[model samples]
Target chain A: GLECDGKVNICCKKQFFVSFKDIGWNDWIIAPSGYHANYCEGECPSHIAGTSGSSLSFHSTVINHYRMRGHSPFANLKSCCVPTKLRPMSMLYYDDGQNIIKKDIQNMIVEECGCS
Target chain B: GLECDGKVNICCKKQFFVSFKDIGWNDWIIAPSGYHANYCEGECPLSFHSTVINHYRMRGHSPFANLKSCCVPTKLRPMSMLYYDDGQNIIKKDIQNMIVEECGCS
Candidate 1:
């Protein structure tokens, strides 16, 4: 309804599945072998501006930077597609003492993505 | 070495202490009776705008909300104090968003 996205190429969130076994770390972990650890992908081209639902101040800052040029300090700065929201995963693994430890892993799952 | 202050009517941080007794909150608070609860007092008039760069990015001549910005605390720190809760408990803790870290209108 609101016009901002030409997004097949815009900096946006995309699906990704990460496997501990594939990366050769499953021997240490005892729980689930893989997860839907989605990632941030696509182009954060400066010319196109509009982060439709991102209410953060950083997104607005990037849009303003895109407008101007010529000798300036912030010219080198550019936005990147990164995880905006991440959820914890309850992990079961062996500690240094070889004891089974169940801990909540922070920033394990990328739930939302945005240009930052 | 700062350049945001051009001496005139720029949107800048100014000193403004608040009294708890004046605001009718002294009865609830115990220690420090009143504090140097500095406020963000300035003018972020739409006519003049240059408080951009290091602080918040300006949203001017918008396709977004073209509302006039006011001097508000863009960042606030916690103030530690002793206070009496509604349950008659002496709660000595940090009150979040009670102190203004800096004044940058947004």
Candidate 2:
């Protein structure tokens, strides 16, 4: 039985999507690596289930304009201590994915890191 | 022959640098095009005196990040906007001139 803060419960090996906001700041979530739960304390837990170590892959409709002046929305999130990887789900795109990661990190820092 | 917000004043063809904060959000600044002043009311003023249309060149060691995502430390704004092609519609020759004449792109 799972006791996570969500409308549905996910059993082992069952796949579900959770937003960073939904995860909240103090709560611990399973790491994609399956080795540990990300406590959101001093550092991120581990690599997300689907993302690569060097690059983050996500879908975005705005092509050719993806890299504006050598800037990508994804890279910026990394600088802020939120590392994102790729997921197989087709629903998430680049811009939206980045936004989600940003919001999650903000929440985590605000709660766990005591950031304002 | 001219008046603007800064310690040094230039009559014409003289070059100086101004930070985006120093310029504030309302005053206009000269454009690299040499024909207009950028009014920061609706949109950013014309291409900064020395930037390419397809790329933004600056002095820094951090990885380049989008204008919106790049956060300033505190009570500060980005010194320059992300240099990008205007909707990817500008021609090549004009972009080249912007790089060479303005951005010092080699």
Candidate 3:
């Protein structure tokens, strides 16, 4: 649920998908962007950054990236222009008892303003 | 808020006292080498290694296996930390209200 700007870092050597819950920010979804999802193969982004702090801080930029990529951010039932609460999930690996357990999983919801 | 190193792999099954902000890294606390508490029961310790990565990695090598279980590593309190800022009440959980409400129920 960590808020994303809709831009995935494609520079990694392996394609690693980071979900919001893994990094401790869970609530918001990754807005759809045109950029092909890149595999995070190298070092991951720092968790201490501002974007990780909250979602409202970067929604506009995320919207713009989505537009350029020919996609739209996830449309919420709520008004798009309303000041959103920031909900950020953490990044973590969930061992689902499957051979593919190590894959990254994002499983939380971050509101546009912040968590309650 | 994910950072820790103190011996609880006691190899599980149960014990139950681990708090450290109930798993998230909120600021910092878990001190003292005492695996006396475990009971994360069966499933805990997320795959994200950061003290749980950000503990300067980790330290300590067991001062005792069957006794004592004492010693210390990093003693910090530097300004003691981040802002949690914006002049807003960042965290909110209304459990206290329910607790007091229950007490009144008696």
Candidate 4:
């Protein structure tokens, strides 16, 4: 298996090959291709899930919540989760030699694969 | 002079035209074309430095910070400011559009 040691700044869309050393059961190994592996932080939890096809299956548990006391109707709960949608990476091109240049962050967008 | 009442977010290169309402004496009216104007926040301070040619001149003060005496410094602070240069002249209408379309701070 490929060993991932350092942080990799993925600025573009391409196939990646690497393996996680200590991925937990509650934690997710989110990636483009629906691939999964078994690993942990040197410990195993209650259950473990893997990836199949384009769907990554996993379990979730309720951690905490809040509710209004009397007649008022208001309650909120925060949960641990992963992103439901993911976008392909893109490249950034600019002339960094200028003393003063106009930069607009809105113009940065994800292009198609193999965009230079 | 043009009355700049709102903020404008310039995301692209173009010409802009607008005036300040309450610009101070020490405050700078930084813009392309090396233009300078006189205005302030309903009050005038001490000195007012204007722009010449492609240079935007302004006065600044310094603050102090404590550091360890044993370590030696290698580099000094850079004399630069973030600016947008699209090589296009800015117009008044462009500033209005930027205020309406993008995020701008007064």
Q: lDDT for every model?
A: 0.50, 0.21, 0.23, 0.18
Best by lDDT: 1
Model 2, position A94, has a per-residue lDDT of 28
Docking class of 1: incorrect
Over the true interface, candidate 4 deviates by an RMSD, in Å, of 25.2
> What is candidate 1's lDDT per residue for B11-61, written digit by digit as tens?
444443545676466787786576554433445542011121111223232
Q: Give the lDDT of residue A91 in candidate 3.
A: 31
Q: What is the DockQ of candidate 3?
A: 0.01
Distance from true location, Cα of B16 in model 3, Å:
21
Residues B17-104, candidate 4, lDDT per residue (tens digit)?
2232222211232433222211111111100000110011111211101100111011112112223345533323222101111111
What are the models' TM-scores? 0.45, 0.14, 0.15, 0.13
Q: Candidate 4 at residue A104, lDDT?
A: 31
Off by over 4 Å in 2: A1-35, A39-52, A60-78, A83-116, B1-106
| Runs in model 3 lying further than 4 Å from the true structure | A1-6, A10-108, A112-116, B1-5, B10-106
lDDT string for model 1 (A1-116, tens) is: 01124546665555555566755568888887877765555555655332423443422332243335422323443444544455778889888886899988765665665543
Comparison by DockQ, 1 against 4, better one: 1
- Candidate 3: tens digits of C-alpha lDDT, residues B18-104: 333543434432232111221111112211211112111122322111111111111111112222334543433221111000000
- The per-residue C-alpha lDDT of model 2 at residue A9 equals 22
What is the lDDT, from 0 to 100, of the residue B98 in candidate 3? 10
Q: What share of the true interface contacts does each candidate keep?
A: 0.00, 0.00, 0.00, 0.00
Instruction: Give the alpha carbon lDDT tens digit for every residue of A17-100 in model 3.
Output: 433444343433233211112111111122321121233222222222333354422121011111112122333333336422
Instruction: Assess candidate 1 and give its TM-score to the true structure.
Output: 0.45
